[PDB]
Symmetry: C7
Subunit: 254 residues, 7 copies
Amino acid sequence: YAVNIVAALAIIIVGLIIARMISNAVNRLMISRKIDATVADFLSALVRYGIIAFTLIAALGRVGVQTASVIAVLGAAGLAVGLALQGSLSNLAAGVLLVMFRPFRAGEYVDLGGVAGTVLSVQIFSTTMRTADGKIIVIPNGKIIAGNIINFSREPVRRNEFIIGVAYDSDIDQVKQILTNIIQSEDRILKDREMTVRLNELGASSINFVVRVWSNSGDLQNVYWDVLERIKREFDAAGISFPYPQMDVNFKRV
Amino acid sequence: YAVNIVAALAIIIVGLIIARMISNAVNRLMISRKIDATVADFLSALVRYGIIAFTLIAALGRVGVQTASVIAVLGAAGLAVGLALQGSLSNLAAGVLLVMFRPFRAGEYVDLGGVAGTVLSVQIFSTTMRTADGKIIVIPNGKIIAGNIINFSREPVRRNEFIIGVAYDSDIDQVKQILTNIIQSEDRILKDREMTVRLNELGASSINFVVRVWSNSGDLQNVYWDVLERIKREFDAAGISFPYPQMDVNFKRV
Amino acid sequence: YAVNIVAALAIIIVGLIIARMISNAVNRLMISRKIDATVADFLSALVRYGIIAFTLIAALGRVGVQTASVIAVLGAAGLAVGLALQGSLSNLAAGVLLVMFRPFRAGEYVDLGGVAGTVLSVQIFSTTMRTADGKIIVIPNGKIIAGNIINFSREPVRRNEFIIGVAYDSDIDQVKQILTNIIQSEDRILKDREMTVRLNELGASSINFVVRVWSNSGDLQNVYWDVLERIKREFDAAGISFPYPQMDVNFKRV
Amino acid sequence: YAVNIVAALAIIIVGLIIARMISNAVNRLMISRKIDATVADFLSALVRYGIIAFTLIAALGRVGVQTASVIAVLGAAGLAVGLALQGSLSNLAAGVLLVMFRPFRAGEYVDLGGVAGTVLSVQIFSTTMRTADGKIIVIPNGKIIAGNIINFSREPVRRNEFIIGVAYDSDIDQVKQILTNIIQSEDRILKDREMTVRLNELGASSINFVVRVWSNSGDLQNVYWDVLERIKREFDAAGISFPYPQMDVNFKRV
Amino acid sequence: YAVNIVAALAIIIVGLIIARMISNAVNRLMISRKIDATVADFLSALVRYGIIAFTLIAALGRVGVQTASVIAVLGAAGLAVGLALQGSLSNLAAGVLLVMFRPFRAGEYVDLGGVAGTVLSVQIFSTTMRTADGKIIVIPNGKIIAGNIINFSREPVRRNEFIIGVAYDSDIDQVKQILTNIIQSEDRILKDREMTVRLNELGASSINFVVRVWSNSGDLQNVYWDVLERIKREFDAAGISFPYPQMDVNFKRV
Amino acid sequence: YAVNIVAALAIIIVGLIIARMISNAVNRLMISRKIDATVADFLSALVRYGIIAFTLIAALGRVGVQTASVIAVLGAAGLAVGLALQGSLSNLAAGVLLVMFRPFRAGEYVDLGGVAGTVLSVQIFSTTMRTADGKIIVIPNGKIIAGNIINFSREPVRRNEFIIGVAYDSDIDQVKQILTNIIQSEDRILKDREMTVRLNELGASSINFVVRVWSNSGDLQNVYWDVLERIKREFDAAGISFPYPQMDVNFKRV
Amino acid sequence: YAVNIVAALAIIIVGLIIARMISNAVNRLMISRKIDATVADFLSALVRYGIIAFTLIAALGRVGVQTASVIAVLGAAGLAVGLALQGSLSNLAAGVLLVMFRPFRAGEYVDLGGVAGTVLSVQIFSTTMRTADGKIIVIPNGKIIAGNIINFSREPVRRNEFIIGVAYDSDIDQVKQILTNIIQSEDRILKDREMTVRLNELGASSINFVVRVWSNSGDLQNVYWDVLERIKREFDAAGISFPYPQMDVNFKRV
């Protein structure tokens, strides 16, 4: 009986002291890292309180008092904190997966479900990238993983797809020859890959040809710009007409 | 049997006395710190009631009545309070993450999933911002974290993208020389970065050029405004036509 | 054995009697407060039934019949009631947060995720507001907190944004001087804050100027109405044309 | 040993008999209320089966067969049923909240998240209303509570908003006077409340005025119809033109 | 020791035999009702396996090996199944609610959140209806209960709403008289209910009147068709013009 | 004590041996069925590890070391694998429900939330269909059940709805007679079911009639095609005009 | 008592030593396989900590200190981790399913819920494909499995659908014959499968015919391009008119 009451008190003391020690330890880590008076004090205090309450529970239980009730309420509380925590816990997990496993790493330009920019840093909970115009976006890793991950710095060659519309009474073959001549002449267009030039759509007020040509990443934006300037000039010289919106109107006096 | 009923009564007495002592202690701390009659009295009273209820449960337990049922029901009820609490709990957690971790801090302008304004203050549960027009928005931290966080004050230089459309019969080279002259002259446009001026789209009734030019956050709104006014005037003088909607109409009498 | 069966019977009796007593007590409290035959009778009866079932469970348990099964079933059912209850519980919690914590209070005009009106009363479970057209909306507090809370009565000054489009051949400078003069003269427009008048967009059939001017809440709807009427008259007099939809049509006989 | 095997057999018998008794009781309650052969037979049988399985488990428990496994499985299954049950249970809870608590009561016209009609009856699980055109909707109370609740029979006076567009060359003042005269004369328009008549928008092909006028619910649909017919007649007489879609076309022969 | 090993073996045997018996019973119920070789065999086998595994567990426990581990794992797995199961379980519950409680029963024409047809059968998990064009739709009861439930076979009289647009220079009064005459003459239009004929909208190119008239469900589709044909004819004869799209075009040579 | 340590060691040995045996058995079943080195080796290994860990746990348990901690961790992990599994488990369940219960079966043409084709096979986890254009889609059963299920093959007779628009000055009666005749003459149109031909809408530039005619599934695509070609020819001959877009333009010189 | 305290201390020592040993073992395996300082050190340490905590729990267990509290809290936390982990664990499970099971395999062209390309590799957690234009997408297997999986390299023959619109006064039969001739002549069109050429829609300004023709995957893109060029040339020669947008305008001077 004496050993029991003494053990209970001894535990109460050991509990209070370790709680103060663990709280002080949490504060050492908070300050060394990145301390915030509210976060360090409140978190350290929550740890200290949980430890002491666990201790009082242990003491009454040793005395013979059934703690089942405090255990169940303590368990429900623990589950609630678990649920709220889960969005952030989820993000952390994704971060780990993302880091060991990963596709995109700092410096690569990517597209993470829309929002595409240059990755500045993949962090614990979120990835930060700098969009093309200069905005800084911070994406939550969990969402990053749920979405597709298209990495642009991984690939070497892509394909441009032009679509020029000419007038209906334009010579199908002439158009084809002129476009074919422009891409054939364009160095930056991989000649060993696709090189499509075809009457593709029977337009509303137009008849348009699709042109598909491959080039290496770097080159591609310019290839499209140059091939297009070229298409505009050659067609103008050759007399091929880029039509305005057409409309047949039938007059009725009244 | 006597030891069990006596122990139960002994526990009830110990529970009531400790409940009163712990309540009085909570009041000592409330007054020494910052006491509020409603907060100190209601909090000390809730602590005292929890302690005694626990004691009664423990006593029926000693008398030897299996409390399993009250424990499960008490447990479910706690889980329910925990579930309801979780949305708000969630917001609190996000706030902590947001504060130690944070991307956007007071004074920065941001877009928190639509709603974009200047951050006035990131608080415990919600962040408050002042939209450009002057509205004051209070966004719940949990929602903020689930969404992307796009911060405009973090990067120093961003890019303007003009898209001027001219009349088809316009001189491609002249249009280019003029736009290039305007951006070249504009001091606020960093000359070492991208300075794109190109025939980009073969329009419906237009033929439009895209101009991409970089400048520092501040300067940027003005740079777009000035470069645009300038483009309107230079083009007018140079005789370049900003076309109206074109339409070729074919007449048919009947 | 006899002590076990007698104790079991003794408990069944103590349970039935206390159940009737607790039920009668619930009714005393129901009547003193605000009694409703269905609520007082059904609630008191539910309490009584729970206590008796608990007791029968304890009796079989006292005898030596493992009640684990009834315990788990009772627990799952308890969880289910907790889940159904959680939406409403959630609303109550939000209400508490809303009340001690609150941003918007009676009399303030606000936007609670779309639905924006004047707050009539922040209640226990729901907030009630009266929309500008006269409708009376009752929004569940849980939803209110999940959504953004933009308060218009908090800040005091807001900004109007006009966008007038004139004809392309209008004098840029003249349009700017006339608009500037109008805002300059209008007393209600805070002169120490932003006062933007600029050629902003190179429109379709138009060329439009953006005007951004600040005023105090009240004044603002009127400032816009008045500044606009003013722009309409001043421009007409000065000969600045508000263009109709333009269109170049090219004729073709056939 | 004998007492144990006998007690086990004694329990199995007590279990089968009570199970048959509880099943028959469930059927007495099913028939007295509203019996359905499938529901009464299947529900009573499920109760009987649960009781017997619990008993066999108990018997196993008496001989020395740990039933922990069956207990855990039974519990998880119980949890799942709670989850499935929760949507329906949620509806019931909202119903109770709705009935003792409620804003809208039979006879009142309301808008329950879209679906707006005359309330016919707030029941246990669902509210039934009759839409203006005659349809009969039955809305689940859970959904009703989650959504906003706007009651039109509560307040009593709302506001009409007319928006009349006239020709650009119309006299701003004349238009204002005529509209003002019309609303001024209309008795049904509360004269002590808002009475706005203003040049609101600088239209595309029009120039439009906004008119805001309050009236009591009933009167309001008619006030709008009448004030409008009146606006049409007066404007026609006064020479004010309601413009057709405008369009400036510029001809080009070719 | 012998009693323990024998009891363990005795349990293993009782477990295998009862498992085969319960499986065979599940098959008897499956065949009597609606048997399906895959469902009856797979379900009966799953029950049999669960019973035997529980038995082996009970046996190792009786021999003297703590099964706690197998119990917790078995428990977690059961929880996972409960979660996957919950969508389907949810549908079943709504089904029960739907059948005893239900608004719509076979033969009634309804709209269950869009998808509107005639109910062919309300089943355990889903309702099946036959759309007006003949398609057969199977809607999950859970979704049915979440959505609004509009029943057309419940009320007997509904309201048609016509909206005829005439030309601006039409006589407001004449249009009203003619429409009024048409509805007045049409027998199938309940004369004791609403009978609205009003200038409702000041159209773009039109000036349209709304006409609301009630009739019995059946009569209603035809009433709308007949009243419309009638409006077209009377108007043509009366000289009232149903206008084509208007457009004032202002010419400019260049 | 010796019996306890020996029993513990004997259990460890029995556990390792059975673990290796169960793993080897899983591989026998993997290879006989459809073996994959990674799946068979990893799955067999996971089973083996779970069995041994369970065994070590049981060994310490008999030896008197409270394994509570290892049990809880083991339980959480099981739940996690269970949660991951739940999407697939969910699909499987849906499949079972789908198979005993089902609406659509092989050969039927259906729309399973968008994606609509001919059902090739309702399997365990997924339903496979062949879209009209020839693509082969594999839809997960869970998604299938959550969505509505619209079956086109279930009704034997369906209905076509034609909507032909004629010119405003067309003879209402003549249009009706010609359409009536066309459907009257078309054998494939079930003459005992609905046969609607009516002036349905007072169109923009047209006046359109709706025609509703039933036929048997097969026949229906062709009935619609044939009836339509027929309508075009008869109307052309009869002189009924299928109008182009109308437009009244009012001229204004300036 | 001495045996109990000594056993508790003996266990604590056995626990620390085995924990250090198992940790060192985990490191041996990590390094032999594929070691990563953070993964090997963090994983080994986590194992070590779990073992020790289990030990303290068991020792406190011997020393009579009830650990229930630490066990429930440890349990709630484990549940929470289960939840965060589930998204990623979900992806892994789908990966196993995908690899042993898989429909699409490297080299096959597929559509995995939008994003359609040529699979480059199905890996442990993600599938990587190269979209037609050349982009490299990485899709998370979990998402892939949730979505529909349509495989193009599985089936071999698909269908092209042409929709040619001609002028209203075109000869229905001639249009049909020319189209039929073209498809009849085109070898690449499977002649034993559907070959539909029909007047399908009664256009706005057109009358359009639908043409459905099958071919083998490869051939199909080209079949469509070629059949189309052919339709354009044949129709031009035959005099069939591809109409621009029609419009009847009625003039009104004012």
